[PDB]
């Protein structure tokens, strides 16, 4: 998808547009002797904040050159912190240390 | 019969981390590193005994 | 084509072999996130000349 910028700019207030967003961490590198291509992608519309607030996980591959891939991302802790069930029967994390 | 382990070898206790993904001479060989050295060894040959 | 060793070890003198050769200078490079595959290339026959 892609949205002009014509509508960007002329849409009432209210619509929600839906823009997408490419992840090029894992787009393939060129080979070393292919010719160059003539052409050259821009991006014109940006997000004014971050986007990915959602993303719990990225990029799960192996890098043959790196320990890991710039950009990959774990899970955090507690997405793994079963914790224990409280005698009030709200959920608990693991203490963070004895006491 | 059980073969002896010949007086050279080093022991090694396999682990996930011990190998890996990596590159040489244009091939994504699972390198091994031995512990020890810390050397890495993209082929099967010429691996530390 | 491919040479078994066998054949060079039981030709005739006078035979004339054709082996084949790779020039891996344009081979690709493997991309970065591929996982490994199993298996080696060897090669048992070798010039003794340029």
């Known amino acids: ?5 014509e509508s960007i700019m002329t849409a009432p207030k209210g619509k929600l547009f839906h823009l997408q967003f490419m992840d090029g961490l894992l787009r393939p590198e060129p080979s070393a002797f292919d010719p160059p291509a003539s052409g050259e992608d821009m991006r014109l519309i940006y997000p004014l904040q971050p986007i990915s607030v959602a993303r719990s996980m990225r990029a799960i591959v192996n890098h043959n050159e790196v320990d890991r891939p710039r950009g990959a991302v774990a899970p955090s802790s507690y997405e793994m912190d079963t914790g224990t069930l409280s005698r009030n029967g709200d959920l608990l994390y693991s203490p963070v240390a004895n006491g | ?6 007086e050279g070898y080093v022991a090694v206790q396999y682990a ?4 890996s993904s990596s590159l040489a001479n244009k091939r994504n060989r699972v390198t091994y590193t031995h512990p020890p050295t810390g050397m890495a060894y ?5 691996r530390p005994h």
């Open chain 1, 1 to 5: 998808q892609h949205v002009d910028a």
């Open chain 2, 42 to 46: 993209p082929s099967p040959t010429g």
């Open chain 2, 16 to 19: 996930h981390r011990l190998f």
């Open chain 2, 1 to 6: 019969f059980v073969p002896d382990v010949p």
